[PDB]
Amino acid sequence: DEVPGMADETALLDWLGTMREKQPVWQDRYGVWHVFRHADVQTVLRDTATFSSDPTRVIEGASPTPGMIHEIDPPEHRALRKVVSSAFTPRTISDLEPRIRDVTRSLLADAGESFDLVDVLAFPLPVTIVAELLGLPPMDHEQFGDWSGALVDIQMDDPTDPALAERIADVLNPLTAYLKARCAERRADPGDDLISRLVLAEVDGRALDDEEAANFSTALLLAGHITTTVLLGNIVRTLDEHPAHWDAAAEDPGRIPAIVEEVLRYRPPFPQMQRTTTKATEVAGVPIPADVMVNTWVLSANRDSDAHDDPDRFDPSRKSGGAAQLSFGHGVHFCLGAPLARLENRVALEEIIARFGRLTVDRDDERLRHFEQIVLGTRHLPVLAGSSPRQSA
C-alpha cells in the first residue's frame, strides 16, 4: 500500500503500468484517489464542476487566495485568466527568443568538457528570463534567484516533513512582498514590463489590485522555474539514452520541437496533478465520495497504450504538438506558460547542439541527484561534452 517515489523511475513506471492494468482507480491509505489511465485523467481534467481546482470550495467560510489562477474554478477562473493573459501575451513570449538565446549561449560558452548541466544552464536560465519579463532591477536579480532557488531546493525534501509549510513561508513571504511593492511602484509609475502590464490591465470591467498582481507574479515564477529546469535535464537524459537523435537534430534543428514534445510525454516534469471532488462522483465506474483529493497520473497517462501506440518507445516522430500535450495539463487550466516552456527548451537544445554536438550523462558521477516529490527529474546532472570549441581536436 505505498506510492513508489520519484527517483527510482523504472520501479515507478513498472508500478503505474500494473495499476493501469489491475487497479486503474485506487484509493491510497491517506484516502487520496489515484487515476492512472489516459481516458480517465482526461475525464477528470475536463470536468471542473466535479473536480475542482479550489479545495476551499468544499469548506464553510474559506475562499481562494486572490491572483491564484491555478486555485480557482470557472466562472472566476475565466474572468481572471482573461485579465492575466492580456498582460502575458504571445508576442510578449516570442520577443524573448533573442535574450533566451543570448543568456543560454553565454552560460554554455563558459562550460567545457565536464560540468553540471543543471548548475550551468537548466537552473539559472528560467529564473533569469522570469526576472527580465517581470522588469525587475538588474541589481535585484541575485536575491530574486536566491528566493526561487530556495523554493526549488525545498522540493528535494520529504513533502511530509512537518516543517515544510514554515520553510516555504520563510521564502515566500518576502518574495511576494518584494513583488507587491514592485506592483505598487509600477501602478504609480508604469514601464514596459509584465508587472506594469498586470497593474495596467483591465478586460471585462476586471482588473488586478496589487495583491492579485503580486500573487500571480509569484505563482508565475514558481510554476515556471522548477518545471523548465526539470524539462531541460530530462531532454538531455533522454537523448543520452536514445543518442542517435543528437545527430538527427544536429543535421536538422527543425526536428528539435518534436524532440521537446516527446520528452514531455516520455518524462513529464509534473507526473501528477491534483483535484478535489465537489460531490459524489465516479471514475471508470469506481465510486468516489465528495470532498476528497484526486491525483491524476499524467506520467501513467503518457505511457498508456490505449492512448499512445508502443507508449514506452521514445519516438519523436509522433504527431505531437499543441493542446494535446498532457504534460502541460488539459482544458481550462492548460499551462499558461507553455509557449515560454517550449521556447526556452527549444533554444536550450539548439545551443547545446551548436556548441557541443552531444552530451552524455555521467551516470556514475555521484553528484547526480533526482527529485523525489512533486517532480520527475534531476536536480544535478553531471555531463560530459562529446566535443566543444575548446579542444584542439
Ligand code: HEM
Ligand atoms: C515544461 C515546463 C512546464 C510544465 C511541465 C508545466 C506544467 C503545468 C501543468 C501540468 C499545469 C496545469 C496544472 C493544473 O491544471 O492544475 C500548468 C499550469 C500553469 N503554468 Fe505551467 N508548466 C511549465 C512551465 C510554465 C512556465 C514557464 C510558466 C510561466 C511562464 C508557467 C505558468 C503556469 C501558470 C500561470 C499555470 C496555471 C494556468 C491556469 O491555472 O489557468 N508554467 N503548468
